Amino acid sequence: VTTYFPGYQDFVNKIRSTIENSFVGWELEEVLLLDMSLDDGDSKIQNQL
Amino acid sequence: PPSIGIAVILVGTSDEVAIKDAHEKDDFHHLSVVPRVELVAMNETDPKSIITRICDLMSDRKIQGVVFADDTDQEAIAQILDFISAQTLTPILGIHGGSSMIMADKDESSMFFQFGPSIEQQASVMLNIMEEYDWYIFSIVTTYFPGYQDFVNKIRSTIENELEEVLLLDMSLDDGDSKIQNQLKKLQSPIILLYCTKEEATYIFEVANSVGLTGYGYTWIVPSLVAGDTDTVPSEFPTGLISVSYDEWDYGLPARVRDGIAIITTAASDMLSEHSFIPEPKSSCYNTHEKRIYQSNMLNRYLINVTFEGRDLSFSEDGYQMHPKLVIILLNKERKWERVGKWKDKSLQMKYYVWPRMQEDDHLSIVTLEEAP
Amino acid sequence: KIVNIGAVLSTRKHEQMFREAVNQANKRIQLQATSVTHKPNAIQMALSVCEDLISSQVYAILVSHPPTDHFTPTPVSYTAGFYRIPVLGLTTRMSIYSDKSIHLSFLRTVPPYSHQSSVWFEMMRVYNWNHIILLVSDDHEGRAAQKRLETLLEERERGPKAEKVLQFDPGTKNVTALLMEARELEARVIILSASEDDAATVYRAAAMLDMTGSGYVWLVGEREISGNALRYAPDGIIGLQLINGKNESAHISDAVGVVAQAVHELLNITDPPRGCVGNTNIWKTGPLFKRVLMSSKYADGVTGRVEFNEDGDRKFAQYSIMNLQNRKLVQVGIYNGTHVIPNDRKIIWPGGETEKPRGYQMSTRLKI
Amino acid sequence: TVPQCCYGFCIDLLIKLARTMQFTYEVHLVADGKFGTQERVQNSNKKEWN
Question: Phi then psi for A44, rounded to 5 degrees?
Fold first, then answer.
């Protein structure tokens, strides 16, 4: 779960493949990517996060 | 086939001249009494006027049994009306509009009734629909209205022999928490049981637009009370969702009103056939007290049990029709309520041969020649 | 914009006292009240229901419940849903009329017999009883209270066992069932819920096999124990009487303190319409009106320290314990919130033993 | 509904049970065949171990 600040896609992919080879069964659920133009009263990030 | 004491109660817009010609018209050839229905219509339906009009027919003569009509949308009216029905100790059933709307909570001696299936008995047709779609999806989202825990447990064990979760709403107010939004959305079943009244549908359908309950694959179910009046169309009410109610589009409430008239005729069928002993209802309003020693009201004895004239009068313990006729509906894209179908004694009669269900297009349509293995 | 609230009963001394209610109501504005006597019949109940009640256009209407039956007492009030006006269940303690749905709202400062007799479930320590059974007539209100005891057991999850339920239809040809499972009862704790003649046949049945002997407890209230039950029934059976239950002063001044509390809570209030006809939809004011009835809790009335339940009871309920010697009730104590109250006298069983013995008794014969 | 002659291995084990923990013996048999079966009836259709 992350915002729109710089390094978004970068650190995104970084963590994404980071444990992708993990010998333990560590779980990667979903990527919450936020845009900072404003918030959203939709609570989409609320119910999704 | 004599004319028993009778007064025909029509409140709200109703068929007057022609149905009037059918009001007392012809009892069946087996009728030891063919009563004279006394036509009744008025603008104000308030019990102060109304109940005074029913007990006013009582004031004129002693009617055999209650045949009433109400075109409004308020069933609680029919409830207190049924309380009056207890005061009169005559048999009754909700015949139209807010009257026909089924509800629980009669008196042990109250013979007032309504025509149709139940939260349960209707929910049976809802299961017949669970077959109509041939899918496993089921869950519960419902408001705080009466029959909550009742129909709750009813559906709960009903198919117990997928059930996701039970969303139980309280109507004191809505909650900006969107708890029902994220939780109901958290219910993923393309099919589920959801029952309420359209009055409670406010924050429910609001949430439905919130999480997109109307999308392809996103579907809901609706009660008869949620289904509201066949005429009235709420916008937030989505198309195609599961619904059922006593059938308006098949025939008018006046159809079951002439039927129920034939039932009021059926009052003396078996009773007159053997017993045939009834006192005339004490006409005095003071009969609300001093008539207690006059007689005990047995009208339910023969009354409850009837099946005749092609529409079975079989009713519930609460008196809802035990062999009911209604229509399940699924609203259309016209902002109208599409015809889903009708199950007569839960007997499946579809509206059309193919349910036009919900761009992957998803359609795998295939065929083959089965060859073991 | 003056306040309004109703009541109805037989003795008009309290109607003048109701003029004193509206009069003194200023204690914490003005109140416009049209009094109404008690229509002895349902018909007349509709007559005044339209006449004074409907035409009231009032904020809300309470009603006193001077029964001594069914929902027939204030059944016109049972029709007030058309108004959907706020009301207070008063001069009847029967909570069948206090049901939430069919009956809409009648605020009862007065005991529901079920939650009342739960005081027995408090006495579970008095007998220190971890076991018991259920005995009652078969009826609506009966099955209700049965669900109440079910709530008692529900709060638990060693424990206060309860064996089985007895429910009798009116005038059972034999309680010999109750005699039978009675023989099946190891423990001595027997729950009891009965109407008048119900408790009668309970008594006539009691000595019939005389299983009423010691090692048999009948736990019920004075609501079951009154009158003929106060006459021919086994004395000293488990019972109490809710304090003030018969007090129309506790009733009247109760409406004073509380009805004035929420009445003050009433002051964009939309009062009812006057014309019954001409008002199609009931006033929505109930949302603040009944929630104001609960949220408004007076300090204390002649009904005692004023509280409420989630159903708008009086909460805070002190009923006075009792035991009957010489067919004579004698207060054994009183309990409300904190009260475990022993009294002077000791309450013997059917036998001379006052102390509740250990009921459950292992029976050698064991069938399989 | 007939009385009969109780005998057998496991039954005897029970006899040994009362033998250890003293309790008088009393016998019954199964009215129906089964032990209990959760069953949805035609009346109220409440599945109950039966």
Answer: -60, -45
B182 and A42 within 8 Å at the Cβ level: the answer is no
Closest CA to B89 of B275, B281, B247: B281
CB atoms under 10 Å from CB of B71, counted, come to 16
The DSSP secondary structure of B173-224, one letter per residue, reads ---TT-HHHHHHHH---SS-B----TTTHHHHHHHHHHHTTTSTT---B--H
SS3 B142: strand
| Beta bridge pairs of residue C300 | C305
Pairing of strands B327-329, B339-344: antiparallel
User: Best mutation site among C363, C364, C366 for testing chain D: the one with the most D CBs within 10 Å?
Assistant: C366
- Of residues C43, C49, C50, nearest to B285 (C-beta): C43
- Kindly report the number of other CB atoms within 10 A of residue B81's CB atom: 27
Q: Can you give the resolution of this entry in Å?
A: 6.2
Whether residues A46 and B178 touch (CB distance < 8 A) is answered with yes
Query: Around Cβ B21, how many Cβ atoms within 10 Å?
Result: 10
Q: Report whether A30 contacts A46 (CB < 8 A).
A: no
Phi then psi for B274, rounded to 5 degrees? Answer: -120, -70
DSSP code, position C101: S
DSSP string, D1-42: --------HHHHHHHHHHHHS---EE----SSSSS---B--S
- Cβ-Cβ contacts under 8 Å, B79 against chain C: 81, 102
Q: Which of C195, C274, C286, C203 minimizes the C-alpha distance to C237?
A: C203
Residue D40 Cα, gap to closest chain C Cα (Å): 22
Provide the residue type at A30 as one letter: E
Neighbours of chain D (3+ CB pairs under 8 A): B, C
Q: Measured at the alpha carbon of residue C367, what is the angle toward residues C366 and D4, in degrees to the nearest 5?
A: 135
Sort residue B89 into left (φ over 0), alpha (ψ -120 to 50) or beta: left
Residue B176 CB contacts under 8 Å (≥ 6 apart), including other chains:
none
CB C49 within 8 A of CB B52: no
- For tokens 């997928």, the residue is B162
